[PDB]
Design a protein around this nucleic acid. Sequence first.
RNA 1: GGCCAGCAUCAGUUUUGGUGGCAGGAUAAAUCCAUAGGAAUGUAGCUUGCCUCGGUAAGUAUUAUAGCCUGUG
RNA 2: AGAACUGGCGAUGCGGGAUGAACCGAACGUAGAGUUAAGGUGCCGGAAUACACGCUCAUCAGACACCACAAAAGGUGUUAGUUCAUCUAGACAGCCGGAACCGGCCGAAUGAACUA
RNA 3: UUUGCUCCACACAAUAUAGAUGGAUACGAAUAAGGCGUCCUUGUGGCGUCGCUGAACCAUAGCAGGCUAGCAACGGUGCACUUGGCGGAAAGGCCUUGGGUGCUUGCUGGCGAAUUGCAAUGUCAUUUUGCGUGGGGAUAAAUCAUUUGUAUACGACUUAGA
Lengths: 191, 197, 136, 172, 106
Amino acid sequence: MKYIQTEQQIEVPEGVTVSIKSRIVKVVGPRGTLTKNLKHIDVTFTKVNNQLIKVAVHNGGRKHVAALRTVKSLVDNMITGVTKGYKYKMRYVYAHFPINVNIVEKDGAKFIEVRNFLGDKKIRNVPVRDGVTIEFSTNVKDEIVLSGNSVEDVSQNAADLQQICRVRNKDIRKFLDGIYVSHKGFITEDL
Amino acid sequence: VEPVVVIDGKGHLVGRLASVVAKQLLNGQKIVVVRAEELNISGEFFRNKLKYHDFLRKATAFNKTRGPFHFRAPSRIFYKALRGMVSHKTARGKAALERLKVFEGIPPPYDKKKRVVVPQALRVLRLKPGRKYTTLGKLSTSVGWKYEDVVAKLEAKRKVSSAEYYAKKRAFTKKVASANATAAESDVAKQLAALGY
Amino acid sequence: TDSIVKASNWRLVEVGRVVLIKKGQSAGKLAAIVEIIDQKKVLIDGPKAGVPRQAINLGQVVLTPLTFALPRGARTATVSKKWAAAAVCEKWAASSWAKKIAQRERRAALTDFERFQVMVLRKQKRYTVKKALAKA
Amino acid sequence: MAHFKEYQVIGRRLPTESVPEPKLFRMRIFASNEVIAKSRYWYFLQKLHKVKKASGEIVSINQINEAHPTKVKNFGVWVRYDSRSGTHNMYKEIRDVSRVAAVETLYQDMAARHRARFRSIHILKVAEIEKTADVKRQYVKQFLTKDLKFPLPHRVQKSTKTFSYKRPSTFY
Amino acid sequence: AESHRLYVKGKHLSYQRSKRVNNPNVSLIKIEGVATPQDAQFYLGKRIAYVYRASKEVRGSKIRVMWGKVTRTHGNSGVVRATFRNNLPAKTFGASVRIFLYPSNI
RNA sequence: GGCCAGCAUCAGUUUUGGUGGCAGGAUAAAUCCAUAGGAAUGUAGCUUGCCUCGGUAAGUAUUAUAGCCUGUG
RNA sequence: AGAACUGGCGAUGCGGGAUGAACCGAACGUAGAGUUAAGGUGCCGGAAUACACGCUCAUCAGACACCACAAAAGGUGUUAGUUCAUCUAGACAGCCGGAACCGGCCGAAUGAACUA
RNA sequence: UUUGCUCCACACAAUAUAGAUGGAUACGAAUAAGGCGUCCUUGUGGCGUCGCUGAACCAUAGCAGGCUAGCAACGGUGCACUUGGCGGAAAGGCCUUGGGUGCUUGCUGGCGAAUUGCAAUGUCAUUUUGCGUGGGGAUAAAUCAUUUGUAUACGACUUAGA
Ligand SMILES: [Mg+2]
Ligand SMILES: [Mg+2]
Ligand SMILES: [Mg+2]
Ligand SMILES: [Mg+2]
Ligand SMILES: [Mg+2]
Ligand SMILES: [Mg+2]
Ligand SMILES: [Mg+2]
Ligand SMILES: [Mg+2]
Ligand SMILES: [Mg+2]
Ligand SMILES: [Mg+2]
Ligand SMILES: [Mg+2]
Ligand SMILES: [Mg+2]
Ligand SMILES: [Mg+2]
Ligand SMILES: [Mg+2]
Ligand SMILES: [Mg+2]
Ligand SMILES: [Mg+2]
Ligand SMILES: [Mg+2]
Ligand SMILES: [Mg+2]
Ligand SMILES: [Mg+2]
Ligand SMILES: [Mg+2]
Ligand SMILES: [Mg+2]
Ligand SMILES: [Mg+2]
Ligand SMILES: [Mg+2]
Ligand SMILES: [Mg+2]
Ligand SMILES: [Mg+2]
Ligand SMILES: [Mg+2]
Ligand SMILES: [Mg+2]
Ligand SMILES: [Mg+2]
Ligand SMILES: [Mg+2]
Ligand SMILES: [Mg+2]
Ligand SMILES: [Mg+2]
Ligand SMILES: [Mg+2]
Ligand SMILES: [Mg+2]
Ligand SMILES: [Mg+2]
Ligand SMILES: [Mg+2]
Ligand SMILES: [Mg+2]
Ligand SMILES: [Mg+2]
Ligand SMILES: [Mg+2]
Ligand SMILES: [Mg+2]
Ligand SMILES: [Mg+2]
Ligand SMILES: [Mg+2]
Ligand SMILES: [Mg+2]
Ligand SMILES: [Mg+2]
Ligand SMILES: [Mg+2]
Ligand SMILES: [Mg+2]
Ligand SMILES: [Mg+2]
């Protein structure tokens, strides 16, 4: 029914400085640097106190106000991304054939490389998104770890690998093998 | 009013630009359209992709030639929407359609000419904000227009020389405005002021 | 490294926002936004330019950057006091907007003779300027 | 239908030898002219007491002018209406400067949201809403907050000439 | 000097017509700078000339002229109606035309 | 006087404006004036609890360092 | 396929319904100026890209009597309603303590069935 | 095949013309943002300003613009020339050096204008061709017939011949 005013709050932490001109958004943290283009949205970003940035939608409709919060969130995860970080751990599961998982690179590439999945002679390769650093988890078995400042970039590169392992032509609830996302949290722990 | 009118296509709605351009011809005004690639169509890209494919599937069945002709390039897509608003099977029609040219890009006459905008065809003014829409070149290139990248390369090369131009201009028209600047306060000035100048 | 967000800072429909009529029997007069009806209509009172207290669409009206202090719902005379009190008209007139409305109405009153006097002057002004233009 | 005035319409059944001075019933009718208005009076009076325009007489017709035309008011509006399935009642709230101004913007709404033309609507009651927080509907109350302001982003300016030599600006 | 024009530029748009049929006896003229029906009233009764060339010399020139007047206005965009000594050829639709400042009331 | 124009003064038809004087109504309703009353989308004043000379948060207060609503005339 | 009354077509052009015997408008000597009907005024196309309030976004939107066909049935798309009820006796959620009930956190509305 | 061709110069013949009559007056990009100015530590910077339409800007006086004189400027503007730079999207146009010829309404003068008789576009654009004079320039082919068979119903195709 066209709400004449609604807004949200991006609370800005210490080591962070965000710069918004037109609808391009840049977040500069101690961890890294992230930029995201919101020109598809139609909102007004407004600085108040340099700790806080408000984003408002004027005269908005139902669907339009709905897009307000998902603006806020998008920026929040940009700030929390540039400080805490994003660590997605995912553990291969195999009922019989052990899943041989590796980082191979040719032509300066860096892909994840999955061998012997369900005894597949075919070699699966999922490319490594820029900004995600992979490591295989020491001391814990069949765990792989994706880390970066972009949730987007990371959690895609997670489901990237997680979906190259789909099983064909069997009941899936019997054959459970794959590489599935174990846990998602931040890079600096205790936070 | 003028001998020839150049219309920057960029940011205009095809059918609304078409309708005004159609009418200029019929009233005798010569029109040339440029940047037909960056023309807009209301509605999101996919629908417009579909619509063209519907156009695409119509042809005379016994001979595919005599059936409708499906042009890809943004100009000809736009010339088509424009032809469709004109009486073109008449002679008056052929006459009107000769007064019109449409180009993708801005070829050499007209790159140093001056190009206008038609607000009632202007997308920014016309569409409710946040309504999905379509850049025409992107559609054309998905239905088989081969030249999108050339036009881009040329336009960027051209857009550079036009800033060189505009740079010197903004600099020289800074000198000129420092000239009227002293002639202000003069006897002649404050008189022209009196009469409105 | 402060944050430096942009602004996009609009003129506001608000009580006390002096406003220029565009279309109407009052067309071209200043009024003030007395109360507010909905996202489209408002109440206006213009009394120092003689526009009636009336409700009006915002589409017949163009918001000015000028605005003064004034209570919501304030009756005509009270609009008169506060209007003059804050020198609304004085401040509209100094504006380059109003000065361009001025400038263009004078060019309408000009007479063929006056028009000719203008041109003679222009050639005179041009000569002195293009002279200056080749010294620097 | 059209643009409205409000009429007091007062009538009585025709005096009968045994019953001189009948009882004088009156309505407040929103119509665009007295000829429509007086038809409505007979339209409703037939749905209340036993009278036809034949057996009746119109005692008076008096236009009713708004009593504070420059004061912005909130209005409760009680309406009965016919949809394509059945007939049902309703309540909406209109914020405007008079009664006659609101009955207009009501008939628009009932047409715009509910596809209800004029003939299918009865106006049951229109009342001022005397105090705030007796206003029940959000689309009004939204306008009642203290010290209201708001912008009008993305401003368009109709052209007076078809061609134009700047690229426009939607600013404000 | 440069400009000797004592007329106002105009265009020959169409005859008078419905969608089905026309009336060559009446033409519709668009006048530069005329916008509104009230803008058009000024040029009522003024005099139009459609100037055009030919192959034969006649009176001592190869230029010929058809002459007419502006009889009344047309619609809400300030197009104007005009009738001529002889009906304009209709090959002229979209051809220039001249509206003179006389007969004057200024 | 042969055809034709152009202007002026008229007549018949008509179209588009500008201006004058009247008649209605709630003898318009409003604005405005005078007056009594009252309220909050509570103005000054006061108190209060934080927060930096810079004002903030909530109680109190009905014209006061704004104003409004309502009846009367 | 067959009756009733009337108006029509047939025997009738003309404006309108793109097209069309029967619909709408209007019935015809030859012409003129004016005004209109029915129907229309983005462009084809004469005539407002007129004003105003809403509603509508469709990877099958929709767009005008006769008329050129779609129904039951569903949707947590989105609008405005209705009848019930919780809500500053800080409700409804996500944590957390006690044993759904009440609270510690919350600072504003929320739940149910239904109408179109 | 009687002296034919072509580029540049001009003369008149004619022939047309979807319709000259002051000037098509050049960033790019955004539009819930930008233009211009200025300043700095040159940034998604500071500050100033503008917008609310080109209703602008430029040009515009002089026999359709006659004949002349002066001053003041050291400017504007046209024509042919020349210096060098740039433009391939359809560049075929933009910029610049230099001397030479003209206009000037920046300002002040002298002369002319009628009788075209109260209006009758009262004639100023541009397109193609032909006929004649010097000024440059250039001196081939194709088809039939003959021939070939990588071709072919016939035409056409592909070879060959001073
Ligand atoms: Mg699969
Ligand atoms: Mg299966
Ligand atoms: Mg199986
Ligand atoms: Mg198509
Ligand atoms: Mg096919
Ligand atoms: Mg063929
Ligand atoms: Mg192809
Ligand atoms: Mg009342
Ligand atoms: Mg009731
Ligand atoms: Mg009913
Ligand atoms: Mg532009
Ligand atoms: Mg005749
Ligand atoms: Mg027209
Ligand atoms: Mg005679
Ligand atoms: Mg008068
Ligand atoms: Mg009067
Ligand atoms: Mg009176
Ligand atoms: Mg009285
Ligand atoms: Mg009176
Ligand atoms: Mg039958
Ligand atoms: Mg028969
Ligand atoms: Mg018959
Ligand atoms: Mg008959
Ligand atoms: Mg008939
Ligand atoms: Mg017909
Ligand atoms: Mg039909
Ligand atoms: Mg018919
Ligand atoms: Mg139709
Ligand atoms: Mg037209
Ligand atoms: Mg509208
Ligand atoms: Mg209809
Ligand atoms: Mg319908
Ligand atoms: Mg249908
Ligand atoms: Mg249903
Ligand atoms: Mg149903
Ligand atoms: Mg259901
Ligand atoms: Mg539902
Ligand atoms: Mg529903
Ligand atoms: Mg429904
Ligand atoms: Mg730039
Ligand atoms: Mg700025
Ligand atoms: Mg700068
Ligand atoms: Mg800068
Ligand atoms: Mg700057
Ligand atoms: Mg070439
Ligand atoms: Mg041979």
